[PDB]
Design a protein around this nucleic acid. Structure first.
Lengths: 54, 134, 339
RNA sequence: AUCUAGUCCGGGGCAGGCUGAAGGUGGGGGAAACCCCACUGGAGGGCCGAAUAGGGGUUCUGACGUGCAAUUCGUUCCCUUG
RNA sequence: GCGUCUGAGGGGUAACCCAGGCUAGGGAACUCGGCAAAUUAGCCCCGUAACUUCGGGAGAAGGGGUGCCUAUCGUGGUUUAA
RNA sequence: CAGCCUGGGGCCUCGUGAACGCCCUGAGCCGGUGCACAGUCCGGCAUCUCCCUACACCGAGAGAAGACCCCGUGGAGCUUCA
RNA sequence: UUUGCUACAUCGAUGUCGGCUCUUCCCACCCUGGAGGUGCAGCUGCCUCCAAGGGUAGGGCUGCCCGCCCGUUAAAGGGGAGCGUGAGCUGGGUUUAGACCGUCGCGAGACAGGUCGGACUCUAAGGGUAGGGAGUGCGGACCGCUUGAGGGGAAGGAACCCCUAGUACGAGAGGAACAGGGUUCCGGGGCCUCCAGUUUACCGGUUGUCCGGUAGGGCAAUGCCGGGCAGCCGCGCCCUGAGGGGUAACCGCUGAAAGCAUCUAAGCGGGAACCCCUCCCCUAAAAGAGGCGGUCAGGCGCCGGGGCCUUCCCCUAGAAGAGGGGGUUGAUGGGGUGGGGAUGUAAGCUCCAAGGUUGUAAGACCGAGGAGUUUAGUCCGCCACUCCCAAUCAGGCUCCCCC
């Protein structure tokens, strides 16, 4: 499955699933992606280490 | 009750005097954990609890007829990450409980928000009124 | 008023001293366990650790027939070299002394790697002919047979050493005469790991743990640090009282050496024995070790010691159950261990 | 009475800001008395504030306690037109 | 003007002590006691309760704004200068 | 319910260079004896010699002719109806 | 283990309440284990005997101790150690000097009544303890492997759930146990794959100022902010049987004294978390000071020689010592080249930029910033290959036994 910030593949047995009060799910490959959505709120379209840059 | 026979034990998320939200329409909104059913510990340690545990709570915020009263509740969501036996880590947005009657049936007729499966397997009456189970 | 709290640490492990050798030998061995002549242990080197996904084997387990996630330790195990044959008897004084050792390297097995540890026998002193007939003369009052084996570290490049380690391993099986015949066939040969163990078995691990130097009492015994003000107040990382009496002021916690102790583990299962190292090596190498290139064992759980630690693997002496073959593995984590 | 207590005589000082008393002027109201607003004015044992500007000596029952020192040092604080 | 608040060197820098930084989940459950530490914080605009000796309370409480760049406008000073 | 990191010490080396404990050097410990809690006495069980770091439980540890209490045909200041 | 009684010891001092920290013991047994009785149907009770191996927790109120109370628990037993422990802390209580109140006193003043404020010194000769190094003995100098007198341990303890079984039992209501499985909590020992913390290695952003501007840097206790590898760590993960012998309380057999009866007197059999062995950790300074394999060439005290250590390159280890390796017959550290990673896409150049300055126009000049070159540039206390560089020189100690 795929990271919700950077879009890359999450190998089994690693990562984190985050559950929000509306029932939606978020997948994170590392803490760097978890912090970049839940804490820093940076957007991924401006970073070219992200699959969403283009 | 029904799924404790597996490895029912996770990260120690909650304690005495920890605050939780009441995820049902019983009337309460916020509570404070007063006792943990079943724990027996060591010198200086505060008893702990995680998902699918029975607790005693005291309602701090809610309707006048339930405020400042003691009830039984089970933990359904927790902020601190915990790992399922298939190796996946789960994490919720807040710590929550649902208030039950002495025989195990929910006091409210509706449950707000998602519920962990370990809470739905151990407490079948709660799973009957829960809409979404994670 | 004098509540109850258990003591800090075990009173049976004192002294917590440094181990006097890096490769310990078991003092006790499992019983015959109704088998035919074979060795009861092997020698390996700890490499690293990863995690696999297997389908559960334990028929009583709650997760039976389901894919569960398990950590594993990787142990590199080249063949060992059989050096000598050793016979024990109850001598006068009624002890368990050694009767004689029968060495055999000259016919084939001329090694100078072996001289980095022992300035071993000259051609002049190859009079081992009459050591063997002493064993056969004094048969029927021999109690144990043991084989001296040698590791071959020169076959492990990540393990930057060439002098070997010498230990002795016990034979358990049929009769004494039957065991003498088996021990003479291994003498001077190379013993693969598959001649001893098989996939699915349980083992006992003996070795030396990671050293940590002189340490305090909060790490050595996990005593409680002084609360509030005392966290601010004249020293907190200590015990208050050192006993009541002048009775040889007693065994209370003190600071000193932590780690590098000889310890033992029970019931560690072997999940796989492999030769194709491309199925175990992660991307970029095992961090701080290197690459596996010999036969390896996949052992589920943890193992005492640091990387490149010699480990003695023994038959289980208080086994919990008796497994069968094939704990099927569906996934192995080959991702990089950096980052 | 070179310390310290009180007094008398002759001297030297208190960075930088704030609030805005009486009094004064101009609008707006109502006959009147008088009221409202804006500005000006610069009072008071008023207020905030400089390690080492000066003065004090509350907390940590902090450091030191055969000291730097027979009373000091650090932090947290108190006063500063009388 | 000084490196003279006049002893230096080595150390993958042990335990521990004196000063300091950060910690997941919980948030006073610690303790005689929230001690210590943390939080807040400058300036402009809006807004400000009970009580009151009518002067105060009051910076009550609370809410919003603030950087950089490119151009402008208004008010005032000064220059032999309405 | 502790963990990791940093400055100055501690640790190893060169130079300078003290103080308190001291009948004695003879001081392992357990049960006793005895002015009633012994390093030294009795009965046992132990015990090869030296050096380094760390800890402060014991030496009724060190430091001060007990401020408490009583006595002395000892004082001093205060009081008054001596 | 209280409170008194006595006045033997200490008045040129044995620091005087409570709490915290840490250790150990008693048994008069609160729970866990065994057996029995009952006004013991079952579940739950009550009582008696053995037994100290393990446990006995979290809070509100008070300086407390006691005590009352809250939610749990298998149970939340009771005592000793100079009322264990201030050269370990604390300083709420108490017993100095300052002050207020009530009562008492002509007064100065008193209370055993209340209240506010009030200092906690020391660098460890000796012993003990926790660890780490040398020496002599066994036994001429060395290399290697072992045994298992002795010693220590709690290394494990407990609860919940499944089935047995809605069964036995009981009118119904209610409602077990043995055998066999799983898990969790408390204790013990370890580890870093996952996750979490840290990460004054490193990468970036940005404020004030200084180095003429850009670029690159100094300072502001990393200036602050964001991310963060290795390592270390817990909030993460792994391991943590039972059996044999001897018994306790007792239960039985055969059996008389005492024709019968009788578990006891002779003579036997069973029987506990107890004790000893199995298991784990230290063990030949065990004086009976153990056993086993190998080296100490050769020539005529000398020549010659073997071994060990420092120096040299290091890390698995490390306070100093020690330990574990490599030393050209070599991959031990560095360099070079690849791999795998951390930040987040360098400087310079080209195009655009809200506007403005010019210029007859064309055009060029300033401009926070945006895009391209560009998964860039910088960095890596990780891995692989490759003799390019360096493991060189030098010094000291001790042996040649048997034949």
């Amino acid at each position: 499955r795929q990271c919700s910030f950077c879009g890359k593949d999450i190998l089994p047995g690693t990562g984190l699933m985050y559950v929000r009060n509306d029932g939606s799910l978020l997948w994170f490959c590392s803490s760097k992606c978890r912090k970049s959505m839940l804490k820093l709120h940076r957007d991924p379209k401006k970073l070219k280490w992200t699959k969403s840059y283009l | 009750m029904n799924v404790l026979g597996s490895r029912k034990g996770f990260t120690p998320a909650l304690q005495h005097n920890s605050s939780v939200v009441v995820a049902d329409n019983s009337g309460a909104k916020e509570a404070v954990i007063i006792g943990i059913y079943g724990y027996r510990g060591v010198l200086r340690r505060v008893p702990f609890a995680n998902i699918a545990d029975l607790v005693m709570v005291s309602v701090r915020k809610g309707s006048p007829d339930v405020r400042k009263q003691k009830f039984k509740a089970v933990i359904v969501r927790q902020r601190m990450p915990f790992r399922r036996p298939d190796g996946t880590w789960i994490s919720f947005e807040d710590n929550a409980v649902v208030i039950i009657n002495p025989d195990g049936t929910p006091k409210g007729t509706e449950v707000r928000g998602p519920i962990a499966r370990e809470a739905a397997e151990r407490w079948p009456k709660i799973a009957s009124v829960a809409t979404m189970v994670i | 008023r004098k509540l109850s709290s258990p003591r800090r640490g075990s009173a049976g492990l004192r002294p917590r001293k440094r181990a006097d050798e890096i490769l310990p030998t078991p003092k006790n061995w499992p019983l015959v366990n109704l088998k035919e002549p074979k060795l009861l242990g092997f020698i390996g080197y700890k490499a690293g650790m990863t995690h696999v996904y297997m389908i559960d084997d334990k028929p009583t387990s709650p997760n039976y027939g389901k894919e569960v996630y398990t950590p594993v330790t990787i142990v590199e195990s080249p063949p060992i070299l059989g050096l000598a044959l050793r016979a024990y008897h109850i001598d006068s004084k009624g002890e368990l002394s050694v009767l004689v050792d029968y060495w055999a390297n000259f016919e084939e097995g001329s090694l100078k790697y072996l001289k980095r540890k022992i300035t071993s026998l000259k051609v002049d002193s190859s009079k081992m002919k009459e050591k063997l007939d002493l064993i056969q003369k004094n048969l029927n009052n021999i109690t144990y047979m043991r084989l001296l084996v040698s590791t071959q570290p020169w076959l492990v490049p990540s393990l930057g050493k060439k002098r070997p380690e010498i230990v002795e391993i016990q034979i358990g099986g049929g009769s004494i005469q039957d065991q003498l015949n088996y021990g003479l066939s291994l003498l001077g040969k190379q013993i693969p790991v598959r001649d001893v163990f098989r996939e699915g078995q349980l083992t006992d691990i003996i070795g030396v743990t990671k050293g940590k130097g002189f340490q305090g009492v909060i790490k050595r015994y996990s005593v409680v640090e002084f609360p509030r003000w005392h966290k601010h107040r004249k020293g907190s990382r200590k015990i208050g009282a050192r006993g009541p009496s002048i009775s040889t002021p007693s065994y209370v916690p003190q600071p000193g050496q932590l780690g590098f102790h000889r310890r033992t583990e029970y019931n560690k299962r072997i999940i796989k024995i492999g030769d194709n190292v491309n199925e175990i090596n992660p991307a970029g190498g095992i961090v701080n070790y290197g690459l596996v290139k010999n036969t390896y064992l996949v052992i589920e759980g943890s193992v005492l010691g640091s990387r490149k630690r010699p480990l003695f693997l023994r038959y289980p002496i208080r086994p919990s159950w008796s497994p069968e073959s094939a704990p099927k593995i569906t996934y192995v984590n080959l991702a990089s261990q950096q980052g």
